[PDB]
């Protein structure tokens, strides 16, 4: 059973649509499965919003520490960090950290608002050469993940390419790139996803995503102990609106494509 056959087998039993894109930076070789198909990004889109602010900070040395007032009215459906700061302030850096490491939805909306709206995040993605990514809505509606809906979607390959450029490539200035990597490595929400399918000692940075239609996503940068980094995007979605998320499928896909490394 080839890697491709294993992925097809995994999808067949999953009850959903699997999208995988792995880039081996050792030789730029790739393992693709429905890598050109669109999937709702859900919270994985937070990486683009945080990175957009990091790009701005390259020309504004006071941006990351800029105060942002948190009001009760700002709270949406999931605000683990933001709710702790109502009536107070959070810096843009702290909002980036909350959005990425805890998937705080209020934090994401604050980043989008600062940038000027969802379309500004799309423009940033385009500036990075990503012609696929599109952010159309704010939290929490960007998570509807309706089959066939182009809003707030991208493809596994496009996201893998951009994540590579953002964390290991040409997208950000060094200090900003390092900050994004630090945030990703400190994520607290991905234990059961890609990380679960890899050797426990491998260093990993990732951003998970989840939404309606049992949409379960994760994008990660992986640092093996004796090999060049791997960039992996695992997207998964189902036909019924209230389907349960399946992080186990992402872990299984990760194990399949990282075999040998």
UniProtKB/Swiss-Prot annotation:
<dbReference type="GO" id="GO:0046677">
    <property type="term" value="P:response to antibiotic"/>
</dbReference>
<comment type="function">
    <text>Has strong cefotaxime-hydrolyzing activity.</text>
</comment>
<feature type="active site" description="Acyl-ester intermediate">
    <location>
        <position position="43"/>
    </location>
</feature>
<protein>
    <recommendedName>
        <fullName>Beta-lactamase Toho-1</fullName>
        <ecNumber>3.5.2.6</ecNumber>
    </recommendedName>
</protein>
<comment type="subunit">
    <text>Monomer.</text>
</comment>
<keyword id="KW-0378">Hydrolase</keyword>
<dbReference type="InterPro" id="IPR045155">
    <property type="entry name" value="Beta-lactam_cat"/>
</dbReference>
<dbReference type="GO" id="GO:0008800">
    <property type="term" value="F:beta-lactamase activity"/>
</dbReference>
<keyword id="KW-0614">Plasmid</keyword>
<dbReference type="InterPro" id="IPR023650">
    <property type="entry name" value="Beta-lactam_class-A_AS"/>
</dbReference>
<dbReference type="Pfam" id="PF13354">
    <property type="entry name" value="Beta-lactamase2"/>
</dbReference>
<keyword id="KW-0046">Antibiotic resistance</keyword>
<dbReference type="InterPro" id="IPR012338">
    <property type="entry name" value="Beta-lactam/transpept-like"/>
</dbReference>
<keyword id="KW-0732">Signal</keyword>
<feature type="binding site">
    <location>
        <begin position="207"/>
        <end position="209"/>
    </location>
    <ligand>
        <name>substrate</name>
    </ligand>
</feature>
<comment type="similarity">
    <text>Belongs to the class-A beta-lactamase family.</text>
</comment>
<dbReference type="InterPro" id="IPR000871">
    <property type="entry name" value="Beta-lactam_class-A"/>
</dbReference>
<dbReference type="GO" id="GO:0030655">
    <property type="term" value="P:beta-lactam antibiotic catabolic process"/>
</dbReference>
């Amino acid at each position: 059973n080839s890697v491709q056959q294993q992925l097809e087998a995994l999808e067949k039993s999953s009850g959903g649509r699997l999208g995988v894109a792995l880039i081996n930076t050792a030789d730029n070789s790739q393992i693709l499965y429905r890598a050109d198909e669109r999937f709702a990004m859900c919270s994985t889109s937070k990486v683009m919003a945080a990175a957009a602010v990091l790009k701005q900070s390259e020309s504004d040395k006071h941006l990351l520490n800029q105060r942002v007032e948190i009001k009760k009215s700002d709270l949406v459906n999931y605000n683990p960090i933001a709710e702790k700061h109502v009536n107070g302030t959070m810096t843009l850096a702290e909002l980036g950290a909350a959005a990425l490491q805890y998937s705080d939805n209020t934090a994401m909306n604050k980043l989008i608002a600062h940038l000027g709206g969802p379309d500004k995040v799309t423009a940033f993605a385009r500036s990075l050469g990503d012609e696929t990514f599109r952010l159309d809505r704010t939290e929490p509606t960007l998570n509807t993940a309706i089959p066939g809906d182009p809003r707030d979607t991208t493809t596994p390959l496009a996201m893998a390419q951009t994540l590579k450029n953002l964390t290991l490539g040409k997208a950000l200035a060094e200090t900003q790139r390092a900050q994004l990597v630090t945030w990703l490595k400190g994520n607290t929400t991905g234990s059961a996803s890609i990380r679960a399918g890899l050797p426990k000692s491998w260093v990993v940075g990732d951003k998970t995503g989840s939404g309606d239609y049992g949409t379960t996503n994760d994008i990660a940068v992986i640092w093996p102990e004796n090999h060049a980094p791997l960039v992996l995007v695992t997207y998964f979605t189902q036909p019924e609106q209230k389907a349960e998320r399946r992080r186990d499928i992402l872990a299984a896909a990760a194990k399949i494509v990282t075999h040998g490394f």
